[PDB]
Amino acid sequence: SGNGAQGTKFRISLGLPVGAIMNCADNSGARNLYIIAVKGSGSRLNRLPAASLGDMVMATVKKGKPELRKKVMPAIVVRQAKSWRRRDGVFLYFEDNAGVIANPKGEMKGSAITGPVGKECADLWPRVASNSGVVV
Amino acid sequence: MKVEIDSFSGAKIYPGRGTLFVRGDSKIFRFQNSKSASLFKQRKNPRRIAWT
Amino acid sequence: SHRKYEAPRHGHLGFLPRKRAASIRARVKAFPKDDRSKPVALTSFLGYKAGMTTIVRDLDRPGSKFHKREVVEAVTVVDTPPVVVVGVVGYVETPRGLRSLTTVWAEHLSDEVKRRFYKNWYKSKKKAFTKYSAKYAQDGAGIERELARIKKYASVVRVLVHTQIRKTPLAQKKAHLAEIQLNGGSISEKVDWAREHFEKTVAVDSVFEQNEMIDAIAVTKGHGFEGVTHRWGTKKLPRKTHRGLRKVACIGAWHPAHVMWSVARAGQRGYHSRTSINHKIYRVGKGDDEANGATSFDRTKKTITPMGGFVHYGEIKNDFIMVKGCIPGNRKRIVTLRKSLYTNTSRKALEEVSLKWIDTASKFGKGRFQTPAEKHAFMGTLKKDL
RNA sequence: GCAGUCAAGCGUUCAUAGCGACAUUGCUUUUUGAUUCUUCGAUGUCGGCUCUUCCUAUCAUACCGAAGCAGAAUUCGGUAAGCGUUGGAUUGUUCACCCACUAAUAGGGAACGUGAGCUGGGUUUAGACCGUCGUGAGACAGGUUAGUUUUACCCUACUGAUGAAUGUUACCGCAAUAGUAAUUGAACUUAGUACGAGAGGAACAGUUCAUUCGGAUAAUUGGUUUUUGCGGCUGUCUGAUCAGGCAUUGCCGCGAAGCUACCAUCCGCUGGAUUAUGGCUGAACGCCUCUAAGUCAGAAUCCAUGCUAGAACGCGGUGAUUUC
RNA sequence: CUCUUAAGGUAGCCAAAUGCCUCGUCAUCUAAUUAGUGACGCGCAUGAAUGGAUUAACGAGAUUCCCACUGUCCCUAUCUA
RNA sequence: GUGAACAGCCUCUAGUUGAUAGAAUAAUGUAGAUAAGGGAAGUCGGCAAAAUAGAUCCGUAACUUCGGGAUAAGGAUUGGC
């Protein structure tokens, strides 16, 4: 996941290797988030680091407000297209990959999230849960 | 424990079976297997698929 | 010359050599510490692995996101008819190891076991224990003597038991025979228990109980001769490489001038002996029970057997052990279910389960129905029927 | 390159917490030289990829002793190589340099490991442009572009696989020897506590998860499809229909089974003895002293438990042992 | 104004396939660029048919980026002959 | 016959059915395919693969030697009756 988090996150399948670009689902003015690092994450020769629902990533904004581009900032993954399996046996998946810009403590830069947002993410990050609409 | 129903075929879904899609709006869809899942993706119409 | 980047070695050197097991029945290599203060009892059991299905249950684990909530788990079911006791073997301690001094057998042995002593039953004269039997003639002595020898010397005591493989869907007629250490108390008590049980039967519910953690011992599924890549999980070489790419590029430095026991090489994969630990009993089935597969929540009458029958195995008509998760070996294969060499306190290990529902749909395709009854209710009348 | 001895000095004061001049003793052989012993009827260059193993001058992780150690953070030092030591941008690069994650992103060896293992970007044949040099042919330790990577079937080693001879044949076992494995992080709680003027700010026990590794497994989900299993489609051929052939598996949708994925699920043991170190009793030396005798506690160490093979010249118990 | 040796680099162009120093400096593009591009120029050693500068079209030529694409890769699996 | 066609695919006439064979279907290959999520992070370098593609109708930039650029680009459509 990351650091700033309230709780733990049971393992969820990885969908977003470094280099993945996800839709930006806040109202910050960024359109993309491009993942360059995953806060969680350990090491294996040749393994790309990869994130998953509720992970904090480090990202840059490829498309979007100029004041917001050309720099690395933390983001949080709130939806993933790669299917994953919950402790209750259900394998679910979203229709896109989406993230929200955040500061290192987990406070969100924006103040609204567009789309649904998976519970696992919601639980890890109060401030995201707070700004979330539908959850799972 | 609940038996869900396949939202394309009306089929009984027991725990662990199939998959659950979550659309953009947030309409949740559940398929019982990968057949209904696929026909859904191809934008088939349940009303014209005779086994549903 | 100092490897440019560092990585962990592929594979575990504690599971070498990676050859075919000697026997298809994997050996119990350790029995639990004996506590001679409690009733004489078997320490393992023999069964046939039949297949897997799915469970639902509430979890009980304070502090977990999933406490007081339903989770859904793979289980595997192993066909477990009663085991028959036909011998006792006594072991003595020596400065060279445990050693067997005698074996005393039962007066009558069934064909199932007798068949284990032959390679060409159809045409043998089946003379197997026919002179041994006569030892019973004499009011006792020969037999009663050897029993007495085991009482006098003898330091550990195992019974000889066999499977009743006929009570099982398998084509194989030859039963499986094994020694199982008697852990209940006192050498003398052990052999009496053993004597008393000769020709008699022993059920699993006298060995194992719900929630128990047990070990499984079995030869692993064979796969024939494998290349390095899948055998060891070595990395594929680039697409560009000449002369193939499922290899390891460098088998060794120039010195030591010898390919070394630690580099990965093609050869047999599978058919190995594994002792797998910590498998929690989730059900102990009764064969006489027509609601095997039911629950205090799912009240329906149904047996554990899947619709269609366990694929590549058949039906479960006997007692059975249901174990959480999975187990080495494949369907049809003999498994020894051993009890724990230790007293786990895991919390995970202490949890008491109760199932809520046991899957029973066909495993032969995407089965949509638990019972014939449910299917007919859903489909209504067909063109066969009525 | 690395480590000492002396101690003038640094260090508010104070040589030696951490450092340390003038001098001075060494060690190493991944630097570079010096030499020219081997190889010029041949030993295939640089870098990378892949993979195994070894060293320790230890970066992380275990337990400790120091401090200019209040707490947190650090720094010096011991026992330690058991276990890890990464993802990228530019460059043929090694190196270098930034970004980024992390417990940490230590340093080295194995013919500057590793080309009948690959690659061929660089170097270093023959094409070619330029700059400098030259009357010229040509030259350049300058830039640039294009430039064929051969053989294993033999021995050995290594992986796995059979097997003669110990009356015959069968079933159940022992265990010498050899291998052996787990790893690291976070959150909750302890606690806004100990400590502190404040700013800040731990840990043990208990709980839930995760990382890297490993061994299996296939309920489930997903991948694969000559099930050529069902259906759909183009073109042609069998007069039409039915039903089929051909199109190097004609194409498309679904697709059981099998195989299989941190793309799936399950499982990964607990006793002793020690190291450093801190101590007990205690002389030597009527005092003192952890040490001389004796002794307690004690680490990711070691030895066992456990786990894998089972000596084809290690072994036990048991069954049946031939008239044609 | 002067010296060598006849003159003394005009018009242009430029770290260019010509720049040692050099991974030049500034700007741009990137999270990050010994790369690319635009600029700068006392240019080791650019420069006018020893042709200089420009240049539409063309190019299995060298080079940089972007969209699309994707088993190149993460990380491998499966099938046919 | 299909179709723009001396293409490809199937056919008639004519000609062949000849290029050791049998049984299996391990590894590793050679040749042919496919892959969830990501999308060049692989690599000296997108090498190899993949993606595009016929026709009709719309639409089409800089620049230019005014000829081009241009199938630029970007879109809709397509069977049977």
For C72-87, give the DSSP string.
Answer: EEEEEEEE---EEEEE
- A10 contacts on C by Cβ (under 8 Å): 65-66
CB contact under 8 A, C65 and A10: yes
Q: What's the N-to-C CA distance of chain B in angstroms?
A: 24
What residues make up the domain containing A57?
15-136
Given CB atoms, is B12 within the 8 Å cutoff of chain C?
A: yes
Rounded to whole angstroms, how far apart are CA atoms C89 and C281?
Answer: 29
The secondary element (H helix, E strand) that includes residue C70 is: strand C70-79
In this structure, is residue A35 part of a structural domain?
A: yes
**Which residue's C-alpha is at the least distance from the C1' of D263?**
A13
Rounded to whole angstroms, how far apart are CA atoms C337 and C78?
Answer: 9
C-beta separation of C20 from C226 below 8 A: no
Rounded to whole angstroms, how far apart are CA atoms A9 and C116?
Answer: 53
Rounded to whole angstroms, how far apart are CA atoms A136 and B23?
Answer: 10
Residues 6 or more apart whose Cβ sits within 8 Å of residue A54:
A1, A9, A12, A76, A77, A78, A118, A120, A121, A123, A124, A125
Q: What angle do CA C226, C229, C233 make, to 5 degrees?
A: 115
C34: number of Cβ within 10 Å: 17
- Residue B10 in tokens: 């009306």
Sign of CA dihedral C326, C277, C193, C139: positive
- Residue A47 in tokens: 């393994």
B38 CA to D264 C1' in angstroms comes to: 20
Rounded to whole angstroms, how far apart are CA atoms A99 and A60?
Answer: 12
In this structure, is residue A6 part of a structural domain?
A: no
Residue C321 β-bridge partners: C78, C284
Listed in order, strand segments (DSSP E) in C200-355 are 201-202, 213-219, 225-226, 267-268, 273-285, 320-324, 334-339
Strand F contact with A16 (CB < 7 A): yes
Name the experiment that determined this structure: cryo-EM
Residue C124 β-bridge partners: none
Burial string for C245-265 (b: 16+ CB within 10 Å, else e) reads: eebbeeeeeeeeeeeeeeebe
Architecture of domain C82-202: 2-Layer Sandwich (3.30)
In this structure, is residue A4 part of a structural domain?
A: no
The answer, yes or no, to whether the previous bond of C8 is cis (omega within 30 of 0) is no
Looking at residue A21, the DSSP 8-state letter turns out to be E
Q: Give the start-to-end residue ranges of the domains of chain C.
A: 16-81+203-220+270-384, 82-202
Nearest by CB: B22 against A89, A116, A133: A116
Given CB atoms, is C294 within the 8 Å cutoff of chain B?
A: no
Counted residue by residue, chain A has a size of 136
**Which residue's C-alpha is at the least distance from the C1' of D221?**
A91
Rounded to whole angstroms, how far apart are CA atoms C339 and C32?
Answer: 7
C-beta separation of A77 from A5 below 8 A: no
CB contact under 8 A, A90 and B20: yes
In this structure, is residue A2 part of a structural domain?
A: no
Nucleotides in D strand less than 7 A from protein CB: 48-54, 83-88, 99-105, 107-114, 116-120, 149-150, 157-162, 169-176, 179-181, 185-188, 207-223, 253-270, 305-310, 316-321
In this structure, is residue A7 part of a structural domain?
A: no
The secondary element (H helix, E strand) that includes residue C186 is: none
Rounded to whole angstroms, how far apart are CA atoms B24 and A94?
Answer: 8
Provide the residue type at C346 as one letter: S
In this structure, is residue A8 part of a structural domain?
A: no
Given CB atoms, is C249 within the 8 Å cutoff of chain A?
A: no
Q: Smallest CA–CA separation between C347 and chain A, in Å?
A: 18
Which nucleotide lies closest to C55 by the C1' atom and the CA atom? Answer: D219
Sign of CA dihedral B8, B9, B10, B16: negative
Q: What is the CA radius of gyration of chain B?
A: 11
Q: What angle do CA C368, C382, C314 make, to 5 degrees?
A: 45
- A124 contacts on C by Cβ (under 8 Å): none
- Class for the domain spanning C16-81+203-220+270-384: mainly beta
| CATH number for A87 | 2.40.150.20
Query: Is A126 strand, coil or helix?
Result: helix
In this structure, is residue A70 part of a structural domain?
A: yes
Nearest by CB: C70 against B1, B14, B17: B1
CA A97 to chain centre: 8
The secondary element (H helix, E strand) that includes residue C379 is: helix C372-379
Query: Is B37 strand, coil or helix?
Result: helix
C-beta separation of A10 from A120 below 8 A: yes
Rounded to whole angstroms, how far apart are CA atoms C88 and C179?
Answer: 8
Rounded to whole angstroms, how far apart are CA atoms C10 and C232?
Answer: 6
Strand F contact with C4 (CB < 7 A): no
Rounded to whole angstroms, how far apart are CA atoms A20 and C252?
Answer: 38
Burial string for C127-151 (b: 16+ CB within 10 Å, else e) reads: ebbeeeeebeeeeeeebeebbeebb
Rounded to whole angstroms, how far apart are CA atoms A88 and B16?
Answer: 8
CB contact under 8 A, B24 and A91: no
According to the 3-state scheme, what is the secondary structure of C12-59? CHHHCCCCCCCCCCCCCCCCCCCCCCCCCCECEEEEEEEEEEEEEEEE
- Residue A50 in tokens: 């990869």
Residues 6 or more apart whose Cβ sits within 8 Å of residue C190:
C40, C88, C157, C182, C184
C26 CB burial (10 A radius; 0-12, 13-18, 19+)? buried
The secondary element (H helix, E strand) that includes residue B39 is: helix B34-41
- Looking at the structure of chain A, the number of domains it has is 1
Chains within contact range of chain A (3+ C-beta pairs < 8 Å): B, C
C176: number of Cβ within 10 Å: 22
Nucleotides in F strand less than 7 A from protein CB: 26-30, 36-41, 47-48
C-beta separation of A14 from A25 below 8 A: no
C82-202: same fold as C16-81+203-220+270-384?
no
Rounded to whole angstroms, how far apart are CA atoms C145 and C155?
Answer: 17
Question: For strand A32-38 and strand A56-60, is the pairing parallel, antiparallel, or unpaired?
Answer: antiparallel
C-beta separation of C150 from C88 below 8 A: yes
Nearest by CB: B21 against A88, A93, A133: A93
In terms of Cα–Cα distance, which of C384, C366, C370, C228 is closest to C302? C370
Question: For strand B19-22 and strand B12-13, is the pairing parallel, antiparallel, or unpaired?
Answer: unpaired
Nucleotides in E strand less than 7 A from protein CB: 30-32, 71-78
CB contact under 8 A, C54 and B12: no
Q: What angle do CA A41, C276, A86 make, to 5 degrees?
A: 45
C-beta separation of C160 from C85 below 8 A: yes
Given CB atoms, is C360 within the 8 Å cutoff of chain B?
A: no
Residue A45 β-bridge partners: none
Please, which residues 66-125 of chain A have a Cβ atom closer than 8 Å to chain C? 87-89, 123
A116 CA to D146 C1' in angstroms comes to: 57
CA C95 to chain centre: 32
